[PDB]
Amino acid sequence: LDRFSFSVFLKEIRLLTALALPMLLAQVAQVGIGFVDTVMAGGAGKEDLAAVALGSSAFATVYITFMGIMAALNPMIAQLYGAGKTGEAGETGRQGIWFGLILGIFGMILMWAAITPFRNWLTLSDYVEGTMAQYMLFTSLAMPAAMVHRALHAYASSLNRPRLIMLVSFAAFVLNVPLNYIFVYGKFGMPALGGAGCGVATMAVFWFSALALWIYIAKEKFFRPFGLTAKFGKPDWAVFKQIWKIGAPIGLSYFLEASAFSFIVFLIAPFGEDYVAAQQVGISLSGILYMIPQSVGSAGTVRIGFSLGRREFSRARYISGVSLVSGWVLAVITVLSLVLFRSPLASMYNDDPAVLSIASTVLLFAGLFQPADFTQCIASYALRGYKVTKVPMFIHAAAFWGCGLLPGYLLAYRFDMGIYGFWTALIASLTIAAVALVWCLEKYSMELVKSHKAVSSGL
Amino acid sequence: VSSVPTKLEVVAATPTSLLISWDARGEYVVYYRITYGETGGNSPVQEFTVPGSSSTATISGLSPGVDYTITVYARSYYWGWYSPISINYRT
Numbered sequence: 001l002d003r004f005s006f007s008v009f010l011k012e013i014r015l016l017t018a019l020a021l022p023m024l025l026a027q028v029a030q031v032g033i034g035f036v037d038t039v040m041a042g043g044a045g046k047e048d049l050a051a052v053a054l055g056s057s058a059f060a061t062v063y064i065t066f067m068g069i070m071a072a073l074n075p076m077i078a079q080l081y082g083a084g085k086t087g088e089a090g091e092t093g094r095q096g097i098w099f100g101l102i103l104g105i106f107g108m109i110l111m112w113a114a115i116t117p118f119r120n121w122l123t124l125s126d127y128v129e130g131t132m133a134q135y136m137l138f139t140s141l142a143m144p145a146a147m148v149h150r151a152l153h154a155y156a157s158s159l160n161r162p163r164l165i166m167l168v169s170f171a172a173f174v175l176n177v178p179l180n181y182i183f184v185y186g187k188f189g190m191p192a193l194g195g196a197g198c199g200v201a202t203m204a205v206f207w208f209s210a211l212a213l214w215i216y217i218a219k220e221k222f223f224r225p226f227g228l229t230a231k232f233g234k235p236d237w238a239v240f241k242q243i244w245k246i247g248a249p250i251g252l253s254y255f256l257e258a259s260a261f262s263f264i265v266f267l268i269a270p271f272g273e274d275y276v277a278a279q280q281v282g283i284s285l286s287g288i289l290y291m292i293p294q295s296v297g298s299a300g301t302v303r304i305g306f307s308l309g310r311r312e313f314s315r316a317r318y319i320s321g322v323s324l325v326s327g328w329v330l331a332v333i334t335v336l337s338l339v340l341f342r343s344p345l346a347s348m349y350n351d352d353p354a355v356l357s358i359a360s361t362v363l364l365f366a367g368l369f370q371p372a373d374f375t376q377c378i379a380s381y382a383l384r385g386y387k388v389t390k391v392p393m394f395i396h397a398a399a400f401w402g403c404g405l406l407p408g409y410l411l412a413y414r415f416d417m418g419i420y421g422f423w424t425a426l427i428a429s430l431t432i433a434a435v436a437l438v439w440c441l442e443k444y445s446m447e448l449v450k451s452h453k454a455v456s457s458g459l
Numbered sequence: 460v461s462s463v464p465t466k467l468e469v470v471a472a473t474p475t476s477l478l479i480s481w482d483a484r485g486e487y488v489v490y491y492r493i494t495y496g497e498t499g500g501n502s503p504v505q506e507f508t509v510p511g512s513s514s515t516a517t518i519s520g521l522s523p524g525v526d527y528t529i530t531v532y533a534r535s536y537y538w539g540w541y542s543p544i545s546i547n548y549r550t
């Protein structure tokens with residue numbers, strides 16, 4: 001009847017020195033990849049009707065979705081950095097790299113099926129189809145999601161002090177941009193197929209960054225145990241089936257932002273059109289530098305599950321706080337440069353072709369949801385991220401869609417100039433997470449009382 | 460001449476039986492006897508006994524939610540006892 005989210009603030013003693021700061025260069029090697037994209041958004045500008053994103057962001061559906069599963073070992077493997085064998089911890093790293101290759105060949109297979117956007121029911125440039133050499137970014141770049149899960153099962157095994165990935169997913173991107181075009185139209189290379197061939201380039205570099213795992217059983221002791229990855233243990237082998245209900249819970253919960261896909265791209269669908277399909281140089285600028293935000297926790301997620309093995313019970317979940325809060329400093333000290341600043345005279349026609357002469361009723365949610373969500377997932381990559389607990393964190397987001405279902409058709413009927421108006425209970429559906437989660441992260445840093453079953457020792 | 464197998468932890472039970480996972484940095488010359496009873500004083504004592512760096516093991520936890528106190532034992536150099544340490548935290 002008042003506080004069923006327990007003793008709030010306690011996530012503080014003298015932890016001013018929580019240095020989950022390499023867990024920034026885990027998501028700055030993720031700007032590193034975030035940003036090839038634009039170099040082939042405006043790389044396949046050379047081709048005009050190479051709007052290509054037309055598959056390339058309907059591919060990375062069964063990337064980021066399946067990817068959910070995969071980066072769901074982030075605890076699995078950091079938490080057994082409080083065990084000993086990086087190669088039993090690693091015979092997961094392997095057992096999954098089998099997964100990231102095995103579910104990798106479903107990206108790579110459900111991608112096969114995928115190719116039938118020969119379908120129609122609503123609005124132009126989201127059904128239309130004249131010439132589709134999308135045909136081939138659909139495969140030439142959907143034939144990759146095999147190697148490309150294994151190429152994430154990488155930093156799904158940099159859950160233990162490295163980002164040898166900021167090394168590569170940089171000289172991965174650089175490698176691709178030469179490459180990128182030598183297919184769109186190129187040299188010696190297969191120079192022709194260029195609208196797909198920006199992605200035969202992209203996908204070619206997934207496979208190169210695939211062996212920028214292989215090449216980092218290099219700096220110290222092993223995470224190489226690629227002895228036959230096989231499973232079989234009863235009817236079917238876990239440490240794999242175990243990956244299962246960290247995976248489901250996250251993918252099907254990356255189907256949060258997977259209908260924050262069909263809400264957002266179905267309210268350009270009334271006669272809303274113009275500056276309402278400018279809700280994408282808008283919310284693609286959520287995405288843009290929401291990625292370094294959000295994903296400190298989707299990296300901090302180690303330094304919690306890790307310090308669970310290394311049995312520092314909430315000497316970790318009472319860093320889950322002073323990590324919740326530290327880019328929650330930047331949550332607000334850059335929710336300011338969002339409702340404030342614009343897309344001004346340096347915005348040309350890049351990641352989405354529309355800049356000059358449209359409204360800032362697009363900054364009107366660069367606050368609404370903006371830091372009242374910033375973290376309301378980094379509280380998940382710290383829950384899940386710490387524990388089992390995406391188990392129905394899954395059902396965390398069965399509201400951050402089904403609660404903002406009706407403030408879906410509650411802009412199109414709006415009280416105010418409610419361009420941010422179905423961003424109603426999709427900022428209030430979406431700060432019923434200031435609760436749901438960070439309620440189980442005080443039901444939860446309250447299980448490391450129950451678990452901390454001897455409060456201190458002898459000496 | 461020293462101090463105890465100096466960690467404490469029983470994480471949880473399997474609400475009948477319990478996990479006891481404590482310090483053991485090596486062993487010594489090597490060995491653990493672990494005491495076994497409530498804190499009731501009545502219900503006599505029993506003994507698990509283990510090897511290596513393994514005060515990190517698990518009990519037969521018979522009786523229900525009942526308070527239970529159980530110490531571990533160091534053994535060393537001298538076939539004697541390098542000190543003992545207990546927590547009481549039951550089911």
Ligand SMILES: CCNc1cc2oc3c/c(=[NH+]/CC)c(C)cc-3c(-c3ccccc3C(=O)OCC)c2cc1C
Pocket residue numbers: 037051053054057058125126261265280283284287288351352353
């Ligand atoms: C840095 C990420 N950048 C992104 C850039 C994008 O640019 C797009 C341009 C387009 N114009 C071609 C003329 C169309 C039609 C869709 C686009 C999507 C898109 C398309 C279909 C369904 C969903 C999305 C989608 O994911 O929307 C999120 C904003 C998209 C997605 C992401 C993630």
